[PDB]
Amino acid sequence: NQQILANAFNQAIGNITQAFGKVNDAIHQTSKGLATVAKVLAKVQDVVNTQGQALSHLTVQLQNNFQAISSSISDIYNRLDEL
Amino acid sequence: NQQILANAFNQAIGNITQAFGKVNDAIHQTSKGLATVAKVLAKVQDVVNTQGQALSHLTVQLQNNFQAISSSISDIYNRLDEL
Amino acid sequence: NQQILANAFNQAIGNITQAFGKVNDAIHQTSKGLATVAKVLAKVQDVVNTQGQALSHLTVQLQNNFQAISSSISDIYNRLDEL
Amino acid sequence: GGVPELTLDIFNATYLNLTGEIDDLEFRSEKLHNTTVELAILIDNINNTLVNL
Amino acid sequence: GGVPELTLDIFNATYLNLTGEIDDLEFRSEKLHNTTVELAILIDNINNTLVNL
Amino acid sequence: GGVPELTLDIFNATYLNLTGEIDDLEFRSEKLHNTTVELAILIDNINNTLVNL
C-alpha cells in the first residue's frame, strides 16, 4: 500500500512537471506574441501618423493653391472686361 | 518511509501551489495585454477611418474644384477668341 | 496515517487536474486572441496601404493638374498682353 | 493653348470595421480574468491538502 | 497679375508590411493550440494516478 | 462667367499616440518572460521531490 502510494506520487510528479513545462512553453509563446504586437504598433503609428501629416499638409497646400488660382482668375476677368 | 513520503508530498504541494501562482500571474498579464490591444484597435480604427473619410471627401472637393476651373478656363478662352 | 496521506494525495490530484484544466482554457483563449490579432493586422495593413497609395497617386495627379493650370494661365496672360 | 486636361480620381474609402474583433479580444481578456479567480480558488484548495502526520 | 505659384509636395508612400509579424502571431497561436492538446493528454495522465487503497 | 467657387476643407490631423500602450505591452511581455524563468526553477523543485523508497 505504501509502495503503491509512493509509485502513484512519483507518476503524478513526473506528469505534473511535464504539464508545467508545457504551460511554460505557452507562457513563452505569449511573451513573444505580445512583443510582436508592441513592434507592430510602432510601425502602424508611424505610417498612420505620417499619412495624416501628409494629408493635412496637402490640404493646406491645396487651399493656398486654390486661393492663388481664384485671385488669378479674378485678375484675368478684370483684364478681359477692360478689353 | 511513510513520513518520508509525507514530507515529499508536502514539499511537492508547496512548490506546486507556487507554480500555479506564477501561472496565474501570467494569465493576469495576458488578460491585461489583450484588453490593451482591444483599446489600441479602437484608436486605430478611428484615426484610420477618419483619414480615409477625409481623403475621400478631399477628392470629391478636388473634382468639383477642377471641374469649375476647367469651365472657367473654357469661358476665358471664348472671351479671348472673341477679342 | 497511510490512508490519511492517500486521501490527501487524491484530493490534491483532483484539484491539480482542475487547475491544469483552467490553465488549458486560458491557453486556448490566448491562442484565439493571437489569431484575432493576426487577422486584424491584415485588415489594417490593407486599408492603411490602400490609403497611402491613393494619397500618393492623388499628389501625382495634383502636381500634373497644377502644372497644366500654370501653363494655361501663362498662355492666357500672353494672349491678354498681346491684346 | 486650350483648356487643360485636369483629371482627378475620386477616392472611394473602404472603412476599417474592427468592432467584432474588438470585442472578441474583450471577451478573451475577461475569460482570462475569470480564469484567474477560479485558479486562485483551486490553488488555495491544493494548499489545504498539506498533511500533518 | 502674373502666373501664380502653385507648389504641391508629392507624397511618397511608405508601405506597411506586416506579413512577417502576421505570421509570427499565427505561429504563436498554433503553438498555443498544440500546447492545449498536449496538456489535455498530461491532465488525463495525472488523473490516472489516483490511488484506490 | 465669373470667378469659380473653389472651396477646400483643411484636414486637421489627429495623431495616433500608442506609446503608453506600447509599452504596457512591452511590460507584459517581459513580466511573462520573468514568469518563465521562475517557473523553470519551481519545476525543477517539484522534480526534486520524487521519492526513492
Author numbering:
A (entry chain A), B (entry chain A), C (entry chain A): 1059 to 1141
D (entry chain B), E (entry chain B), F (entry chain B): 1324 to 1376
Paste lines from the article.
Virus entry of CoV is mediated by its spike (S) protein, where its S1 domain facilitates attachment to host cells, and its S2 domain is involved in the subsequent fusion between the virus and host membrane. During the fusion process, two heptad repeats, HR1 and HR2, in the S2 domain, assemble into a six-helix membrane fusion structure termed the fusion core. The formation of a six-helix bundle (6-HB) fusion core brings the virus closer to the cell membrane and promotes membrane fusion and infection. In this study, we have determined the fusion core structures of CCoV-HuPn-2018 and SADS-CoV at 2.10 Å and 2.59 Å, respectively, thus further completing the structural profiles of α-HCoVs fusion cores.
CCoV-HuPn-2018 is the human isolate of canine CoV (CCoV), which was isolated from Malaysian patients with pneumonia, experiencing a respiratory illness. Likewise, HR1 (residues 1059–1141) and HR2 (residues 1326–1376) regions of CCoV-HuPn-2018 S were constructed. HR1 of CCoV-HuPn-2018 forms a 23-turn α-helix, while HR2 adopts mixed conformations: residues T1342-T1372 fold into a nine-turn α-helix while residues V1326-L1341 and L1373-L1376 on either side of the helix adopt an extended conformation. Then, three HR2 helices pack in an oblique, left-handed and antiparallel direction into hydrophobic grooves on the surface of this trimeric coiled coil, forming in a six-helical bundle structure with dimensions of ~116 Å in length and 30 Å in diameter with a left-handed supercoil. To compensate for their longer HR1 regions, the HR2 region of CCoV-HuPn-2018 also contains a 14-residue insertion that folds to a longer HR2 helix. Besides the nine-turn helix, between the N-terminal Val-1326 and Leu-1341, plus from the C-terminal Thr-1372 to Leu-1376, HR2 has an extended conformation, contacting HR1 residues 1101–1134 and 1059–1068, respectively. Among them, filled by the side chains of Leu-1339 and Leu-1341, could be a potential pocket for small molecule inhibitor targeting. On the contrary, in the helical region of CCoV-HuPn-2018, residues on HR2 mainly engage residues on HR1 through side-chain to side-chain interactions via not only hydrogen bonds but also salt bridges. Overall, the fusion core structure of CcoV-HuPn-2018 is very similar to other Alphacoronaviruses, such as HcoV-229E and HcoV-NL63. And the superimposition of the two structures of CCoV-HuPn-2018 and HCoV-229E revealed an RMSD of ~0.477 Å for 83 Cα atoms of HR1.
